[PDB]
Design a protein around this ligand. Structure first.
Ligand SMILES: CN(C)CCNc1ccn2ncc(-c3cn[nH]c3)c2n1
Length: 274
């Protein structure tokens, strides 16, 4: 194989997700993202059916990359003496929902609904493939600004979906549910619904609802922008203090606020082009 079948461009960003660069597969000029992760900072390993000891990120990505989906797919990966290199796809042009929100503030409800729905679909896809992301938040969502398609990234805190209790979390705290904060115990679907509630508030209000543990535990959400009563109702339902009082994915997509979603292309024509 050997690594210079891609051409390396600018550093796109770096953080707990590793360092990610803009790249082009030389074979067919396909845009790509080259992620490097140091082996030293991988706490969670898995194995590939074949028998190789890989990072869990790569196991989870292989399971969800069957494609097509609203997940950025893993096209190839490589081992190095001190790091793994992952070759993922890259939309052009692209902006992460975090930067998009920093720039435009609270999103119009019709835009939030398209975006949230598409997130719901991607999260359904991961669950349907046996993958829990465990760090759903605006920084982990890419927008393809031409097609209006959202795409999920950075599965480094994810786990295989399981029906028993999780006692380990390494996601973002301010998107984590009260039962983790208080007891260090959660279940996959209900924690994911909670973070989908923090995301939905984030989109309609321009910011996350809670910063502090005490605020999460209390679960009382104040609205700082004018948000519709139906949208407020769905947000508060995802943010219920008791996991069992949170909605299923089906109940979210059957909520009256989620009816008449725009299709991605209309979404980009109306809210994203020019
Ligand atoms: C979290 N945030 C700093 C995003 C970093 N900027 C970018 C820009 C474009 N792409 N295109 C694919 C990716 C990708 C990131 N991880 N896996 C794929 C990517 N990241």
């Amino acid at each position: 194989p050997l690594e210079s079948q891609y051409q390396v461009g600018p550093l796109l960003g770096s953080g707990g997700f590793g360092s990610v660069y803009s790249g082009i597969r030389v074979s067919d000029n396909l845009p790509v993202a080259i992620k490097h992760v140091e082996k030293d900072r991988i706490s969670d390993w898995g194995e590939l059916p074949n028998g190789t000891r890989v990072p869990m990120e790569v196991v989870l990505l292989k399971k969800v990359s069957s494609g097509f989906s609203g997940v950025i797919r893993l096209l190839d990966w490589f081992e190095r003496p001190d790091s793994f290199v992952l070759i993922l796809e890259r939309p052009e042009p692209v902006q992460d929902l975090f930067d998009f929100i920093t720039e435009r503030g609270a999103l119009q409800e019709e835009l939030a609904r398209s975006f949230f729905w598409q997130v719901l679909e991607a999260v359904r896809h991961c669950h349907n493939c046996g993958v829990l992301h465990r760090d759903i938040k605006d920084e982990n969502i890419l927008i393809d600004l031409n097609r209006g398609e959202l795409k999920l990234i950075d599965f480094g805190s994810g786990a295989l979906l399981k029906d028993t209790v999780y006692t380990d979390f390494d996601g973002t705290r301010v998107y984590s549910p009260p039962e983790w904060i208080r007891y260090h115990r959660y279940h996959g679907r209900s924690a994911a619904v909670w973070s989908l509630g923090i995301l939905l508030y984030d989109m309609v209000c321009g910011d996350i609802p809670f910063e502090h543990d005490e605020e999460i535990i209390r679960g009382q959400v104040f609205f700082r922008q004018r948000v519709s009563s139906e949208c407020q109702h769905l947000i508060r339902w995802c943010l219920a203090l008791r996991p069992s009082d949170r909605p299923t994915f089906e109940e979210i997509q059957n909520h009256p606020w989620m009816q008449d979603v725009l299709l991605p292309q209309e979404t980009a024509e109306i809210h994203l082009h020019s």
